[PDB]
Design an enzyme around this catalytic site. Structure first.
Site, PDB file in Angstrom:
ATOM      1  N   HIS A   1       2.760 -57.906  37.116  1.00 12.40           N
ATOM      2  CA  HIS A   1       2.083 -59.126  37.515  1.00 12.40           C
ATOM      3  C   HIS A   1       0.616 -58.913  37.851  1.00 12.40           C
ATOM      4  O   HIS A   1      -0.119 -59.900  37.970  1.00 12.40           O
ATOM      5  CB  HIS A   1       2.816 -59.788  38.694  1.00 12.40           C
TER       6      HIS A   1
ATOM      7  N   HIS B   1      -6.625 -60.935  41.206  1.00 13.38           N
ATOM      8  CA  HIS B   1      -5.989 -61.984  40.434  1.00 13.38           C
ATOM      9  C   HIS B   1      -7.060 -62.741  39.685  1.00 13.38           C
ATOM     10  O   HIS B   1      -8.211 -62.795  40.125  1.00 13.38           O
ATOM     11  CB  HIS B   1      -5.109 -62.970  41.239  1.00 13.38           C
TER      12      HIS B   1
ATOM     13  N   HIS C   1      -8.515 -58.106  45.937  1.00 14.21           N
ATOM     14  CA  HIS C   1      -7.814 -57.891  47.199  1.00 14.21           C
ATOM     15  C   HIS C   1      -7.733 -56.396  47.467  1.00 14.21           C
ATOM     16  O   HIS C   1      -7.098 -55.665  46.696  1.00 14.21           O
ATOM     17  CB  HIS C   1      -6.408 -58.505  47.175  1.00 14.21           C
TER      18      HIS C   1
ATOM     19  N   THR D   1       0.480 -62.965  49.220  1.00 11.93           N
ATOM     20  CA  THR D   1       0.496 -64.120  48.325  1.00 11.93           C
ATOM     21  C   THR D   1       1.518 -63.975  47.221  1.00 11.93           C
ATOM     22  O   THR D   1       1.629 -64.864  46.370  1.00 11.93           O
ATOM     23  CB  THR D   1      -0.871 -64.382  47.680  1.00 11.93           C
ATOM     24  N   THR D   2       2.243 -62.871  47.192  1.00  8.49           N
ATOM     25  CA  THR D   2       3.325 -62.673  46.249  1.00  8.49           C
ATOM     26  C   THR D   2       4.570 -62.333  47.034  1.00  8.49           C
ATOM     27  O   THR D   2       4.470 -61.883  48.180  1.00  8.49           O
ATOM     28  CB  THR D   2       3.009 -61.527  45.281  1.00  8.49           C
TER      29      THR D   2
HETATM   30 ZN    ZN Z   1      -3.526 -60.113  45.889  1.00  8.27          ZN
END
Ligand code: ZN
Ligand code: J4D
EC number: 4.2.1.1
Length: 257
Positions: A61, A93, A116, A195-196
């Protein structure tokens, strides 16, 4: 398993991780007019001079660059933080189009991508115990804008072909993360979550005001990565961002007037 498509994307995550609907979820939209100057915030202290990068990994991902976190070698302190946090990894991302890609937004403006930089609180001994704590992680968020190339990103860009598909990793030593920082270290901060999946509410977010610019051709190379594993059908790795979540009972504080 979870992903970012129609059938397994963020609107489905709550079914396996009910914290997806919790009280301190990220990302959020940063309303610059209701964020609050906090003059009690200290300046950030970023000490990346001894950082030891190890390798780069397509995990299906995103792509992570990992660091030696067995010693205080690349640490984050100051700001809203109390204690020392070690850099363990960074990742990005990004979108399929230049006008989308970031997770956090500023006055509902989307950026082309977010960096991040993930740090964990040494107090808690190892990363696995930190993620179980309200103040366990500190993630430094940096926005990317399409413009002039960022020289210090190019070594990441040039290795991406060797980790095209999910599960591939490559040795990636002597990368210096200081090449990724903007000039100013002004920021907003609020308590949030990963966030995941598993979306644990363990993160002090630190989102820098100043974006860094990267060239059109650097972000194109992000978009040629593969969600799938080798031999599987090709899904381009794009739009791996979670939409903004309700702020609810939180306040965003700023370190600048
Ligand atoms: Zn992230
Ligand atoms: O996500 C983890 N760190 C992480 C955070 C963010 S982020 O919140 O900063 N965005 C993005 C990415 N990323 O690579 O996209 C990350 O890999 N750890 C993690 C975990 F602790 C588990 F228990 C677990 F089951 C699992 F799969 C995990 F992967």
């Amino acid at each position: 398993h979870w992903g970012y498509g129609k059938h397994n994307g963020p609107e489905h995550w709550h079914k396996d991780f009910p914290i997806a609907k919790g009280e301190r979820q990220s990302p959020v939209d940063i309303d610059t007019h209701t964020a609050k100057y906090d003059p009690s915030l200290k300046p950030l202290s970023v000490s990346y001079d001894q950082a030891t990068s190890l390798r780069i990994l397509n995990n299906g991902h995103a792509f992570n660059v990992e660091f030696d976190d067995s010693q205080d070698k690349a640490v984050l302190k100051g700001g809203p933080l109390d204690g020392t946090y070690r850099l363990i990894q960074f990742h990005f991302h990004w979108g399929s189009l230049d006008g989308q890609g970031s997770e956090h937004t500023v006055d509902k403006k989307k950026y082309a991508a977010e960096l991040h930089l993930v740090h964990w609180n040494t107090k808690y001994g190892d990363f696995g115990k930190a993620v179980q704590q309200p103040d366990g992680l500190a993630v430094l968020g940096i926005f990317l804008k399409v413009g002039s190339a960022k020289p210090g990103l190019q070594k990441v860009v040039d290795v991406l072909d060797s980790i095209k598909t999910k599960g591939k990793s490559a040795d990636f030593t002597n990368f210096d993360p200081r090449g990724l920082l903007p000039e100013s270290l002004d920021y907003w901060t609020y308590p949030g979550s990963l966030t995941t999946p598993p979306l644990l509410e363990c993160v002090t977010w630190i989102v820098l005001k100043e974006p860094i610019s990267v060239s059109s051709e650097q972000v194109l190379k992000f978009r040629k990565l593969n969600f799938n594993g080798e031999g599987e059908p090709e899904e381009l790795m794009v739009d791996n961002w979670r939409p903004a979540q309700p702020l609810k009972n939180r306040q965003i504080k700023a370190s600048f007037k």
